[PDB]
Amino acid sequence: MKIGVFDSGVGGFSVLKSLLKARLFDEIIYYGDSARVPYGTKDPTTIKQFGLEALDFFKPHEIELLIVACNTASALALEEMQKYSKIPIVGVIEPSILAIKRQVEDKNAPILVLGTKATIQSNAYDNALKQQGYLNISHLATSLFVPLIEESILEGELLETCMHYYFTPLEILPEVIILGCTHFPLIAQKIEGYFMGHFALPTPPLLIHSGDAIVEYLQQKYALFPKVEFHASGDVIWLERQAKEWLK
């Protein structure tokens, strides 16, 4: 079995990491559109065209399944990609919705969706949660988390101040937080710490991680050390250097 993983750049490595530790595939063709990243600050028309173009990249690699690791592409382009595509394409949004159903039985539990601007604006997460019965959904574009994490600012007063900037306006105190962006797992502990420390919270909110959720989904569909090809629209060496650090 040989699959491809598509992402806007290097944030996809947080999904690639979970896929690797589940050893469900033999061959993984990773493609990151690092020349044009990020997608989250751009518009639906551009993003959809990007997704269609990613389809053309994988054509000569003869994969049987495409994982869209990017939450932004999953939110804006997955539908259009699935139309033009003969192999199945699994994004990271629907699998997270399934994990929420399994881990969050109270449909009134306050859920907070975190993602890029484009992802939040699309309402992909909110619409899918509502169709599954959830009645207490909040969403927040935390755009600056992406560049902060990509600069390796994973702790310190800059990250803390960025979190306070996004989180201080929150009306509802969340029980569940959806990490609806490839980058956010790298600061998951810090997001937890923020809510425990800023509110009288003994335990932290529950965090839904997109890579762990797609793996659960994929395990409920396929059978039980993989080769990995790294491709990039930018400098592939720069992307590979990034991979070594993300996959730690």
Add this chain to the structure above:
Amino acid sequence: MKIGVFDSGVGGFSVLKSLLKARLFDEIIYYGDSARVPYGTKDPTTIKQFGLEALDFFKPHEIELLIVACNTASALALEEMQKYSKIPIVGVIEPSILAIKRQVEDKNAPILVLGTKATIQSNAYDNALKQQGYLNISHLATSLFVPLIEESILEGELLETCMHYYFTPLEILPEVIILGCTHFPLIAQKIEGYFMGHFALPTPPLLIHSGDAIVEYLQQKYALPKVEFHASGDVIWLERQAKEWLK
């Protein structure tokens, strides 16, 4: 006269603002590569290709001069674009060197270059400054200023914390600060305020504004309006930004 202005996205509006204020040109074709912005976190190979493709865009427009408003493309791609262009291309690095030569007589005056990671990595500013005899040159990639400014984070604790993060390891106390990036003029006052506070200065450092330097350069060099906006992303989003950046 009809010219082109090229930028990676909306940052170039800080150059367009200076051009419009100076009333230099009757017709201006602005092109922002907003589908692929930012350039400054990317690699020299990618950026040079971006520059060459920018030339293909202006071909049907019959411009007489291309202003490369982007400091990153000025630093990595300008030499290659000029190889393949019959019309003169002017970037925003060389004009800033002239601005400094005109305003900074002392060769030992400490100059601090701020720009993207790619702009700083190229050493385009330091090399031109050393060639002109300046002895005290420092540089600093302040990458996160770009997404902060594009989020309209132009004041407050987050910006102040970002400035401190970048400026704290500074050895030198600058008399000159090159705003070597389209976005940085939008926080010029905050940068001045930072350095006056933390080094107890009676007057602010001299900030070199790329847009103002190119205006002065074009006036000296050419003895001297309708804008149309184009984008590789949604042009409506870029024009919405134009209203905000252009005052």
